[PDB]
Amino acid sequence: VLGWRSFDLLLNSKNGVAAFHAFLKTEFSEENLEFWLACEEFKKIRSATKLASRAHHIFDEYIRSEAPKEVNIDHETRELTKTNLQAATTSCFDVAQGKTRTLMEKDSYPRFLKSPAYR
């Protein structure tokens, strides 16, 4: 309910997330969370093919150069994901998701708390 102000509590709150998202949507970086919630679902797939399928879709939506909801990762993170895509495993987007978490956490999160959205 209030504990939000740990960060991952915000994330494990079906209410928290939906909230945070509205903030970001204005601040223009909701893709970070979308990609994050995405990798979260991705993890639940067992079917090898369905995995390759989504692995490729996530890539084209978030990682792909100039992708629509392209996230902000570095060179080493991207190539690595790119290589992982070569064999869709559930651990595929882990690092990417990792770095993304931080970006939200240490940047847009605080500026999020101290604001109307969280009052």
Add this chain to the structure above:
Amino acid sequence: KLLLLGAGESGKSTIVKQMKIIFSGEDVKQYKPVVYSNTIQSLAAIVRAMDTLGVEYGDKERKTDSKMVCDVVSRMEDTEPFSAELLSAMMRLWGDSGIQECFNRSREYQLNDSAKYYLDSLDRIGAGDYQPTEQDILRTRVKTTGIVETHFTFKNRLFDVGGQRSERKKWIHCFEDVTAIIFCVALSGYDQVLHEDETTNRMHESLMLFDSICNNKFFIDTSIILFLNKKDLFGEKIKKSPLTICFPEYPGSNTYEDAAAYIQTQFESKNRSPNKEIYCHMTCATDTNNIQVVFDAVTDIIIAN
């Protein structure tokens, strides 16, 4: 309406922290963590690059306290105050000749801008009573994502953005009616590569970036002010790092004035319509006066309209 646009790590945000100093304890209490990270991290960077470059430790007995740091970065426990054994492991490490040798080659890898500054204050910030300096808050680094708007009136609207390539597609939004635009450019980047691809020359990306931003239609009747930021870092390196590493062509001599003249001409040439003017400024986001003085001048160019 003002756009604080620029490439990655050019200081578009350090500049906003000077629009502030022109930080309640609640805030200063917040940067305590940040400054912890920036430090442990920067040290971490040089540890790793030690391997990637093949830089022998000045003292084997450092591999110990060394790895003790990477675990911290790993354990994520690097946002919390330096445990006694750490503040020392780092101080002792930051004091090895190898670290220094590999640190001096910091242009060959990605190492925090404020790396030196913080590590030269391991003790200063490792105090149980520690409170963040007016500067400590500035020398911090936190990749900005999306567009962050802040307001304020000086002599009678601010827009911060993300510099990396994947942020630029979002820029197009706040592009409507932009009074003026301050464009940051890390002078220090001339011999470095982007964060996004360890290939592209940072300096070069700025030029291709500015060229795009400069001759955009949306800004025909918009004031374009250029901040050739990080002029301090630029000065302490230009003497030992040829500007030709950026411009094979560069015929001048490697001196602050010379290279700055050239670097200034390159950006100004990326301007199309002769019916327009641009404003250079050797700024330094981490020095309030300089920002203060320059921002003043800027307010003029803008009000002078």
